């Protein structure tokens, strides 16, 4: 569920998913195409690929079980979908943290029109 994913982002980066990551670069937020602009933007690209692999799961609304086991976001046991969706979310949240150093505010609100290039492959 996006609201849980949102919580992970805040927990991992200290920032709010909105608007810091809802419209960043070419892949963060709705849509996505062209090539990732930077580390951060790549995190979003991969997450998309991740969700792409779950063709039959309600990736955005399915509520899963997870928890901060010793300051570590750990996915709980549920259905294949929940466990899979949670992992995508888990990895993305942390990828954002690892890329905080190259986070560019100039990429926040990046026009999708400026993302014209052969969109990358998963
Ligand atoms: Ca996207
Ligand atoms: Ca559920």
CATH label of the domain that carries residue 36: 1.20.90.10
Q: Are 37 and 110 in contact (CB under 8 A)?
A: yes
Mention every residue, 6+ apart, whose C-beta is less than 8 A from residue 6.
Answer: 16, 17, 18
Spell out which residues have Cβ within 5 A of ligand 2, the ion.
62-63
Q: Pairing relation of β-strands 66-68 and 73-75? A: antiparallel
CA of 84 to the centre of ligand 2 (A): 12
Spell out which residues have Cβ within 5 A of ligand 1, the ion.
27, 32, 48
Q: What SS3 state is found at 108?
A: strand
In degrees, to the nearest 5, what angle opens at C-alpha 32 toward C-alphas 68 and 99?
Answer: 45
Q: Which of the ligands is closest to the CA of residue 61? A: 2
The total of structural domains in the chain comes to 1
Going by the DSSP 8-state scheme, the letter that residue 104 receives in this structure is: -
Question: Annotation-wise, does 62 bind a ligand?
Answer: no
Q: Are 53 and 12 in contact (CB under 8 A)?
A: no
Residues identified as active-site: 47, 89
Resolution of the experimentally solved model in angstroms:
2.8
Q: Is the peptide bond before 118 cis (omega within 30 degrees of 0)?
A: no
47 is in which domain, residue-wise?
1-122
CA of 113 to the centre of ligand 1 (A): 14
Q: Are 119 and 96 in contact (CB under 8 A)?
A: no
């Amino acid at each position: 569920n996006l609201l849980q994913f949102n919580k992970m982002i805040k927990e991992e980066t200290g920032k709010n998913a909105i608007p810091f990551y809802a419209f960043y670069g070419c892949y963060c937020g709705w849509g996505g195409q062209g090539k990732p602009k930077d580390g951060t933007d790549r995190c979003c690209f991969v997450h998309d690929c991740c969700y792409g692999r779950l063709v039959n799961c309600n990736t955005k609304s399915d509520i899963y079980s997870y928890s901060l086991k010793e300051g570590y976001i750990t996915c709980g046991k549920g259905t294949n979908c929940e466990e899979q969706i949670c992992e995508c979310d888990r990895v993305a949240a942390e990828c954002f943290r690892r890329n905080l150093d190259t986070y560019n505010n100039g990429y926040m609100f990046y026009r999708d029109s400026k993302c014209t290039e052969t969109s990358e492959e998963c």
